[PDB]
Design a protein around this ligand. Structure first.
Ligand code: NA
Ligand code: NA
Ligand code: NA
Lengths: 119, 119, 119
């Protein structure tokens, strides 16, 4: 669910706010089209594609679905007790959190004009 | 709930992204005031008024309430097993999805400046 | 939960829309950094800090957590039947609703450019 994704992010990028990732580029936190602005934005595009695949499971609603994971400080693991939807969503969140940790953050791509940059 | 509304939209307007409707005009996806910018925006205003009416039912929370509906490809139906809140919310979502299918989409009303257009 | 906070606001500031508070300053409805733009924005900053403290309770997710409160027209009370997470979240929402009622609303701080005002 949304809060668990937020906490995963806090596990891997403890210095940045969840808000820095909530409105970046063409895909982070909002938007589903256009050319990704930079590598971080690409991470968000992959995450978006990942959630769309999980939504194919009947009744699977990513932002609302609770799952079992663990952050053993810096390290993320999706636990084996998860159902199909949970496990899928947990995987999507995990991979994105790790993707966000490696990508550089360009302050200029924060809170951009979707009409001007997103195709 | 939010995901079911998203899927209703995908049933009736399969070509557009849910994101195209999430930030349009003065009423689509956000905002509750000002003069609607075009016919599509009017659809969103009617939907907003519809959710406010459903919220009069104790404990009825539109974006969170799950309901029974079906999309038999292009066609939408709210199933008879729904409680009062569910049935109401399902109706609101159904009528808007169909409204969105007929209204033309003006690219210029996407992600507008609420301060500049919304009274 | 989100809808209950919205209703608390409607209890204390019946004249304004929930939307007027959903995108104001650096902290209302979104953003977690920068210098608060005015007293209303400070209310939102305190509310944000309050939710972060409640999130320390295992499994406590503010926007999703349902609680027991009552609005006896103008007056707000968090009922004694709430668990730790509920009671905390209810308190955060109550204090903010009352804070919003006293602070003046500056139309110029609505839907601002986060890049330009938020540090
Ligand atoms: Na690159
Ligand atoms: Na017309
Ligand atoms: Na002051």
């Amino acid at each position: 669910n949304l809060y668990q994704f937020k906490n995963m992010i806090k596990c891997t990028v403890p210095s940045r706010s969840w808000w820095d990732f909530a409105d970046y580029g063409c895909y982070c936190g909002r938007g589903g089209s256009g050319t990704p602005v930079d590598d971080l934005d690409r991470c968000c595009q992959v995450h978006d594609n990942c959630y769309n695949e999980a939504e194919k499971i009947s009744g699977c609603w990513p932002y609302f679905k609770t799952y079992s994971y663990e952050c053993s400080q810096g390290t993320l693991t999706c636990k084996g007790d998860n159902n199909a939807c949970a496990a899928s969503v947990c995987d999507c969140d995990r991979l994105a959190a790790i993707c966000f940790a490696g990508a550089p953050y360009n302050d200029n791509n924060y809170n951009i004009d979707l009409k001007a940059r997103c195709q």
